[PDB]
Amino acid sequence: KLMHALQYNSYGGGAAGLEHVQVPVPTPKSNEVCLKLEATSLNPVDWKIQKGMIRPFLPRKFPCIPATDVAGEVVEVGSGVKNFKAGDKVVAVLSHLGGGGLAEFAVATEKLTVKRPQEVGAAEAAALPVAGLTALQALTNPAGLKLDGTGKKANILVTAASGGVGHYAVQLAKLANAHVTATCGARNIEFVKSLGADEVLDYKTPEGAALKSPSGKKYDAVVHCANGIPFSVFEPNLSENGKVIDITPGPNAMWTYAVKKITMSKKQLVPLLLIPKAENLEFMVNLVKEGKVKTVIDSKHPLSKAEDAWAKSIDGHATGKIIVEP
Amino acid sequence: GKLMHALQYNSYGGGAAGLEHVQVPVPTPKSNEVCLKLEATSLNPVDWKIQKGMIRPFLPRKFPCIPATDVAGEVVEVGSGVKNFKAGDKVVAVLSHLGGGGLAEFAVATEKLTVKRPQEVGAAEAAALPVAGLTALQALTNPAGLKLDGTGKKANILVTAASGGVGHYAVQLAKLANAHVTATCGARNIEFVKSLGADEVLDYKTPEGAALKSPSGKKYDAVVHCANGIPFSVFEPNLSENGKVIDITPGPNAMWTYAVKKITMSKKQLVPLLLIPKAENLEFMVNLVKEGKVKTVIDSKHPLSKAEDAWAKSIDGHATGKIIVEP
């Protein structure tokens, strides 16, 4: 049997290089489940890979069916799978950031598959893994926040807060009882405010460009989802041992990190390298089930027009998360 | 103001020839600092790499630059906030932020990175310790996860370029943790590395050595990788299921290769070692040396008046153990 999918065949083609195809339905390996997809979300790293940001390592092969964040129903399980059976609703992270999400079916490893409770729809779940776990990891590891009421107090800054990672980060930080400052564009100020941010800066204004807290807060940590801001801009806004947590770091961020750690600066730049874990996804899924975290969907698009979604992703102005269905 | 002898370089890329003898003011310690009359200074590869430009434009912070960070000496003046040290104390220290300072008669160290030198540990053997020894110590106790009481279950450890500064401490530290140790070096240094306690020694000029192939067919749980020019592909089939390559003195490429491997979730991992020097760890090392459980091997000693010789020896890469300038 064949399935619809989208793929690209080389670097740099953008949405135009995204091509509709029919490929074999995958067979799960022994530790895998095969999913009939119900929803897939896009992440910026998906088109960055296409652009060549992580060449030659990714993709492993052309052509590449992109996207990793999915939700669907199990239809076949590998010979070593115990926790899942045909008919289970799940959310998963597709493996090794090697795509498979823009298709009708995908295989996920059992380790990166988590049950989807009835109360959580497919789109709102598929939106979670990369963006949500990234936010979750930024705030609980380098920012060191606790999500109950244990937890040290903190001043947190979220740049590009209306985007995928940013909109989860703002919500997560308020659960950790942090004071939250956010930057975004004029159009999204009310929306970010509604996510619970205490202060919202328009990054087009001198104050916003300066990342200057209106109440004069210094930030203990920054969830930095935006681009093009030198450390020098952050530095005077940081507390004594403040950290800039760089989301989706490139080669330059990784080296700047090395030398700063080397030279022992008190104010630190921390790249966030996501390690997705089932427990954390479960945790996030449950927050969404309890309504403690809200998944905001920017737009939905059918697989037959997924190039539209891709283009929306590349253009960078999504509010929340972009969804392709399946 | 009194002057002191020092060596400095004024731009990138000059090598030993660009090293110049000068007289500069003796430093005044800030409130959290001690001023040391130096008795010894050791060189580290990162010292000439910085001069070469490996970390431009971040280092050095200014030209000219008096290089080297690993020192031992006697306190002669303390800043107004210093309590744990007084004039006359013998100490070993790491000079700050890799802004050098060590090829001089006096230097200032922060109290946080200054540790007492016990009588039984000479100045040269202590000055050799900080960067090379703490690097080794951090590689084995954090990503390798070994315990230095030896009761831990037994790892297979590989040390590449084991006759060098970091390598020679790593081999000794790994034997304290009761690991099985495989080491690579040149033909000339095989007996020396064996004497450090390595269980297996490979000549890296032989096909087996180039392949990093354990003679007894061990897979390595961790590699303290002090050598250069070895792709991950060479390590990979010698690694255990979740083995790690701990890259000593990583560059831009290592840091990015690390990111993407972690990102793609490979079970065999490349770990860059970014040294975080701490007083408690230096104390610990100094005490090991005092107890004779770790030996400092000194490659050669040179007077400050001829420190360009030491620098050249460092750049050339064939030191056995640690190179020392006095002061």
Residue type, A269: L
Q: Is A305 on the interface with B (CB under 8 A)?
A: no
B240 three-state secondary structure: strand
Q: What are residue A206's phi and psi, to 5 degrees? A: -55, -40
Cβ neighbours of A254 in B, within 8 Å: 252, 255-256, 258-259
Considering the domain architecture, whether residues A89 and A213 belong to the same structural domain is answered as: no
Q: How far apart are CA A174 and CA A167, in angstroms?
A: 11
Number of neighbouring beta carbons within 10 Å of residue B86: 11
Considering the domain architecture, whether residues A108 and A237 belong to the same structural domain is answered as: no
Q: Is A241 on the interface with B (CB under 8 A)?
A: no
Nearest CA in chain B to A265: B97
Q: Is A54 on the interface with B (CB under 8 A)?
A: yes
Considering the domain architecture, whether residues A267 and A143 belong to the same structural domain is answered as: yes
Range of the domain at A115: 1-130+276-326
Enter the tokens of residue A108. 């996920």
Considering the domain architecture, whether residues B242 and B109 belong to the same structural domain is answered as: no
Strands (E), B136-231: 156-160, 180-185, 200-203, 220-225
Considering the domain architecture, whether residues B136 and B244 belong to the same structural domain is answered as: yes
B53 three-state secondary structure: coil
Cα dihedral: A283, A284, A286, A288 (round 10):
170
Q: Is B256 on the interface with A (CB under 8 A)?
A: yes
Considering the domain architecture, whether residues A119 and A181 belong to the same structural domain is answered as: no
Residue ending a domain, choose from B239, B256, B276? B276
Where on the phi/psi map is residue A182: left (φ > 0), alpha (ψ -120 to 50), or beta?
Answer: beta
Nearest CA in chain A to B274: A262
Where on the phi/psi map is residue A137: left (φ > 0), alpha (ψ -120 to 50), or beta?
Answer: alpha
Exposed/middle/buried for A94, CB within 10 Å: 0-12, 13-18, 19+? buried
| Diameter of chain B measured on Cα atoms | 64
Q: Which of B259, B274, B275 sits opposite A249 (nearest CB)?
A: B259
Binding-site sequence positions of B for substrate: 56
Q: Do A54 and B260 touch (CB under 8 A)?
A: yes
Considering the domain architecture, whether residues A190 and A270 belong to the same structural domain is answered as: yes
Q: How far apart are CA B113 and CA B101, in angstroms?
A: 14
Q: How far apart are CA B290 and CA B112, in angstroms?
A: 21
CA distance A57 to chain B (A): 8
* DSSP state for residue A158 in the 8-state scheme: E
Considering the domain architecture, whether residues A149 and A180 belong to the same structural domain is answered as: yes
Is cis: bond before A326, omega within 30 of 0? yes
Considering the domain architecture, whether residues A253 and A326 belong to the same structural domain is answered as: no
Residue type, B280: E
Cβ neighbours of A46 in B, within 8 Å: none
Q: At what angle do helices B252-264 and A251-263 cross, to 10 degrees?
A: 120
Considering the domain architecture, whether residues B263 and B151 belong to the same structural domain is answered as: yes
Q: How far apart are CA B181 and CA B48, in angstroms?
A: 29
Is cis: bond before B25, omega within 30 of 0? no
Q: Please, are residues A36 and A105 in contact by the beta-carbon 8 Å criterion? A: yes
Q: Is A231 on the interface with B (CB under 8 A)?
A: no
Number of structural domains in chain B: 2
CB neighbours of A115 closer than 8 A, spacing ≥ 6?
Answer: A88, A89, A90, A91, A282, A285
Q: Choose from A254, A256, A267, A272 for mutation: most chain B CBs within 10 A.
A: A254
Nearest Cα to A240, choosing from A218, A258, A260? A218
Is A116 marked within a binding site?
A: no
Exposed/middle/buried for A206, CB within 10 Å: 0-12, 13-18, 19+? exposed
Q: ∠ CA(A99), CA(A104), CA(A109), 5° rounding?
A: 50
The CATH number of residue B261's host domain is: 3.40.50.720
The CATH number of residue A25's host domain is: 3.90.180.10
Considering the domain architecture, whether residues A43 and A60 belong to the same structural domain is answered as: yes
Q: What are residue B5's phi and psi, to 5 degrees? A: -75, 145
CB neighbours of B32 closer than 8 A, spacing ≥ 6?
Answer: B79, B81, B82, B110, B111, B112
Q: Which of A249, A264, A271 sits opposite B97 (nearest CB)?
A: A264
Q: Which of B55, B276, B277 sits opposite A259 (nearest CB)?
A: B55
Nearest Cα to A244, choosing from A194, A261, B82? A261
Q: How far apart are CA A167 and CA A197, in angstroms?
A: 10
Where on the phi/psi map is residue A94: left (φ > 0), alpha (ψ -120 to 50), or beta?
Answer: beta
Residue written as tokens 């067919």? B217
Q: Please, are residues A280 and A147 in contact by the beta-carbon 8 Å criterion? A: no
Q: How far apart are CA A162 and CA B126, in angstroms?
A: 54
Please give the full DSSP string across B55-108, using - where no structure is assigned: TTTTSSSSSSB----EEEEEEEEE-TT--S--TT-EEEEE-GGG----SBSEEE
Q: How far apart are CA A222 and CA B197, in angstroms?
A: 47
Q: How far apart are CA B49 and CA B80, in angstroms?
A: 35
Q: Which residues pair with A219 in a beta bridge?
A: A238
Sign for the CA dihedral angle at B258, B262, B263, B266 comes to: positive
Q: Is B59 on the interface with A (CB under 8 A)?
A: yes
Q: At what angle do helices A278-289 and A129-140 cross, to 10 degrees?
A: 100
CB neighbours of B79 closer than 8 A, spacing ≥ 6?
Answer: B29, B30, B31, B32, B33, B34, B111
Nearest CA in chain A to B250: A258
Resolution, rounded to a tenth of an Å? 2.3
Considering the domain architecture, whether residues B163 and B272 belong to the same structural domain is answered as: yes
Q: What are residue A22's phi and psi, to 5 degrees? A: -125, 120
Number of neighbouring beta carbons within 10 Å of residue B317: 12
